[PDB]
Structures are given as structure tokens and as C-alpha cells.
Design a binder for this molecule. Structure first.
Ligand code: ATP
Ligand code: NA
Length: 461
């Protein structure tokens, strides 16, 4: 990913974008009851915490494009993956605007919360006026589509979230590249069935984990994997992607019945952005807020791992590559051990920066004891080991609970964290509940008891 040019949105007929300059994250009732070291991300150039230019930093993610064409390996990678997907018998038809707007089996309705994007964001018009569940009225949207068309600029916001002190001082705030309700709808109509098939099929055939339910899915994964697990982390995956990987992606879509509209992929690759008062053009890089960012990122990651394997181990049997990805995150396996470090090397050549799994100092042997996926670990239940516990570190929860954006969502926020934490074990969960109930706010929450959660879990399978 790389920015071709950037300039005053006025110089090209685009209005300025008002981006709130103050975070919505303030200390929560449990701020001093739990330990945390994260603070809200820098939102403006002025943040006294900054130690380098904000503009430079928030864009540093676009390290450039490393490859040009789609080589032999990539092509083979494409064939193999496209091969697997073929077996899912994916419906290639388009999705009727209605099902695409309000949802259908395999696809959730649009999220009334997220930005409507341009031009609406600048017109004040919000989704709540265009959509409206009850009737599933296509008319207003249908109208707006003809009126404003598609392939509209991406509105860019700084993501308001908790970050390390380092990523605070270094202005390393993440950015949200929001898509227009139109493009979002168009794409959902174009790929809606692809999206559905993936959500309904997390596993090693789609190589996707998108849509998955950790509480159930974790037990299925170990069975799907091969003997030897191999993993690593990406650094700026999304932004590091080069045009070639997008072309490779289209080659797959094409091979499975979507050549029809692979054009949509072109705007993810080459895209138009509006950030504040400026406008820029990016070559490469997967935008964060588009319909299908997750899935396409996962499909591409599936192409990548195959590639680096075909390029490093001539003769490698891709059919025994069992991997599951969720955007840049991934968990893979092969009958034989492989060198993560070696693969990471071939990676640089493809414009990917790969480092030891979970910020390890070095690439080490991946095991069921240390491997993570979505920050979560794998732990077989003591009483019934054939049931695997998706285990997220308590630290992650402690951090999240020390802050709040809205007091009205405290019940929901804590309840959620509880559904995550209890997997750490009864002793741990109860200490957690104890502390929560050590201040007025918590004592007023409707939190589930361990035994309740654990039994429900057992029956869920
Ligand atoms: N608006 C967004 N919302 C959600 N996720 C985003 C958004 N923008 C980018 N991302 C994701 O976050 C990633 C970057 O997160 P992060 O700042 O932690 O960088 P990192 O590469 O993980 O750093 P490190 O290599 O040191 O671990 C992107 O590659 C992309 O997957
Ligand atoms: Na882009």
C-alpha cells in the first residue's frame, strides 16, 4: 500500500470532513479497581502526549508496494485455493437489494451505528432515515443509489480506542476508512452470497474464521489442523498489501463465478480517500471499513501462506495445509515442521512483514499450549477435555473494563467481558466478579454466575 498523492479537498471539489477532536473514552466505575496501562488513542495533532508528527505517523502504515506482477507461485496459490472454495458449491447469483440491506441466512443486516459515509456524512443524512427495519423498504436506498451512484470516496476517521502508551506517544493511531452506504450495499448485493457461504462455513475449507463463535468453534479447530502448527504475526498487513495480491484475489473470485463483478475489488486496491480537509489517492492497501474487508483480507491471507510455501518448499503438499484466517490473524498447520523464520524471509519479497507469533523475541515452536487466535488461547476443559476453552487473557479484560464510552452500555459492556473471562476458570472469574461488586456501579449489574455459564456452555454443543 502506498499514497500516490494528497491535497486540499477544496482544490478538487470536496467538502471538509468534521472529525470529533475529543475522545469518548473516560475512566469507568472500575478504573481504579483494576490495573490497566492503555489510554485513548491520539485523535488530533494537538495531543500533548504526542512525540512526533501525527499526520506522518497515522499514515506511516503505507510502507509501499513491494511486488508488481502475480508470479508463478501466486498463480499456483490462486489455483489451489480457488480449488478448495470450488467444493463449497458457492451460489454465484447476485443478492436482491432487500436481502442485502436487511439481511438473510448467512448475512446480518447493515449496522445502523457505523458512518453512512460520503456524501451523506457531509449532508447530515444518517442511515436511520434511509433504511428502517420494519418495512425493509428498498425505495429510499434504491433511489439514493441512482442519484449518487457508486465507487464513492472513502471517509477517513481516526479510530477512537484504547492504545499502548507507546502507540500513543508515537501517534500510531489506527484509522477507519469508511465506505459509502451505496458502495456497501452494492458490494453486499454483488458478494452477499459469497459472504454468506463464508460465515456459514468457518473452517479449513474457506480458510476463514469470519462469522465464527469462539465458544463453539474452538473445539472444532484442533480436529481440523494437521500435526504441526506454524504461525506468525503480520505488521501492518492491511496497508502492506500490494496491488498484485488484489489481482490474485480477483483471479480466485473469477475462477469461482464472480469474474462478473471483480471490478469492485479494484476500488479496494486503488482507492479515493477524504481525511479532514485533505484528499488522497492510495495504490494498494486494504481499506478498513468496506463491505468484505475481513473476508477478502482472509482470502488474500490464504493466497499469501500458500505462496510463501510454494516458494520456499518446492513439492509442499498444499492439500495438507490446514489453516484458518481472520484477516491478518491466522492459525495454520502441516504434517511436517516448517521454518516460520524462513517463510518470513520470503514474505518480505512479497511486501509482507512477518514476525514471531505473539511478539515473541524469536520464532519458536508453535504448540497447543502457546498458540493463540484472536488473542485467545486453547485449553481443554478439565471435566470434559473434548471441549476446548477459548481463553482470552484477563489482562485484556482488565484493560477494557477500566474505561467507558457510554454509561448506558455499562451493563452490556461488563456482561460481554464476563462471557469472555469465565473461560479462565472459576477461581479467576469469581475474583473478577468480586472486584466488580466492590463499587456501587458493579453491585447493580446483572452478571451471570460461573456455574450458570459453564453448564450453558456444556449444553451448547
Ligand atoms: N479502522 C480500523 N478498524 C479496525 N481494524 C483496523 C482499522 N484500521 C486498521 N486495522 C487493522 O489493524 C492493523 C494495525 O494494527 P496495529 O496498530 O496494532 O499494527 P501492528 O502491525 O499489529 O503492529 P505490530 O507489528 O507492532 O504488532 C491493520 O493491519 C488492520 O488489520
Ligand atoms: Na486502498
Amino acid at each position: 500500500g502506498e499514497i500516490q498523492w494528497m491535497r486540499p479537498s477544496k482544490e478538487v471539489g470536496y467538502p471538509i470532513i468534521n472529525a470529533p477532536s475529543k475522545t469518548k473514552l473516560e475512566p469507568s466505575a472500575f478504573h481504579y479497581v483494576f490495573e490497566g496501562v492503555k489510554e485513548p488513542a491520539v485523535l488530533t495533532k494537538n495531543d500533548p502526549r504526542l512525540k512526533t508528527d501525527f499526520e506522518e505517523a497515522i499514515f506511516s502504515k503505507y510502507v509501499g508496494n513491494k511486488i508488481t506482477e502475480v508470479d508463478e507461485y501466486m498463480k499456483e496459490a490462486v489455483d489451489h485455493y480457488a480449488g478448495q472454495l470450488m467444493s463449497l458449491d458457492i451460489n454465484t447469483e447476485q443478492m436482491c437489494l432487500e436481502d442485502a440491506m436487511y439481511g438473510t441466512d448467512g448475512l446480518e443486516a447493515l449496522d445502523l451505528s457505523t458512518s453512512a459515509g460520503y456524501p451523506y456524512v457531509a449532508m447530515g443524512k444518517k442511515k436511520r432515515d434511509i433504511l428502517n427495519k420494519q418495512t425493509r423498504d428498498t425505495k429510499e436506498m434504491q433511489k439514493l443509489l441512482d442519484t449518487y451512484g457508486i465507487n464513492l470516496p472513502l471517509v477517513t476517521y481516526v479510530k477512537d480506542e484504547l492504545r499502548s502508551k507507546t502507540k500513543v506517544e508515537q501517534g500510531k493511531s489506527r484509522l477507519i476508512e469508511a465506505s459509502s452506504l451505496n458502495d456497501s450495499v452494492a458490494m453486499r448485493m454483488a458478494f452477499g452470497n459469497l459472504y454468506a457461504a463464508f460465515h456459514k462455513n468457518p473452517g479449513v475449507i474457506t480458510g476463514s474464521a469470519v462469522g465464527c463463535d469462539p465458544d463453539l468453534f474452538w473445539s472444532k479447530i484442533p480436529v481440523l489442523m494437521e500435526e504441526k502448527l506454524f504461525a506468525f504475526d503480520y505488521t501492518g498487513y492491511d496497508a502492506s498489501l500490494s496491488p498484485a495480491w488484489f489481482e490474485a484475489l480477483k483471479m480466485v473470485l473469477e475462477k469461482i463465478g464472480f469474474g462478473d463483478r471483480v471490478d469492485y475489488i479494484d476500488y479496494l486496491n486503488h482507492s479515493h480517500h477524504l481525511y479532514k480537509n485533505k484528499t488522497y489517492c492510495v495504490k494498494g492497501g486494504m481499506p478498513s471499513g468496506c463491505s468484505g474487508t475481513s473476508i477478502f483480507n482472509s482470502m488474500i491471507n490464504n493466497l499469501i501462506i500458500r505462496t510463501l510455501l510454494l516458494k520456499t518448499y518446492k513439492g509442499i503438499d498444499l492439500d495438507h495445509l490446514k489453516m484458518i484466517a481472520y484477516g491478518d490473524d491466522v492459525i495454520a498447520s502441516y504434517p511436517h515442521e516448517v521454518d516460520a523464520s524462513l517463510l518470513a524471509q520470503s514474505g518480505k519479497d512479497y511486501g509482507l512483514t512477518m514476525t514471531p507469533a505473539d511478539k515473541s523475541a524469536t520464532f519458536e515452536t508453535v504448540t497447543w499450549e502457546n498458540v493463540t487466535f484472536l488473542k485467545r488461547f486453547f485449553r481443554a476443559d478439565e471435566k470434559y477435555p473434548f471441549l476446548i476453552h477459548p481463553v482470552m487473557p484477563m489482562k485484556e479484560i482488565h484493560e477494557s473494563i477500566r474505561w467507558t464510552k457510554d454509561p448506558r452500555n455499562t451493563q452490556d459492556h461488563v456482561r460481554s467481558l464476563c462471557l469472555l473471562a469465565w473461560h479462565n476458570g472459576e477461581e479467576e472469574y469469581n475474583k473478577f466478579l468480586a472486584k466488580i461488586r466492590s463499587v456501587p456501579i458493579g453491585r447493580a449489574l446483572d452478571l451471570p454466575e460461573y456455574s450458570t455459564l459453564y453448564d450453558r456452555w456444556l449444553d451448547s454443543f
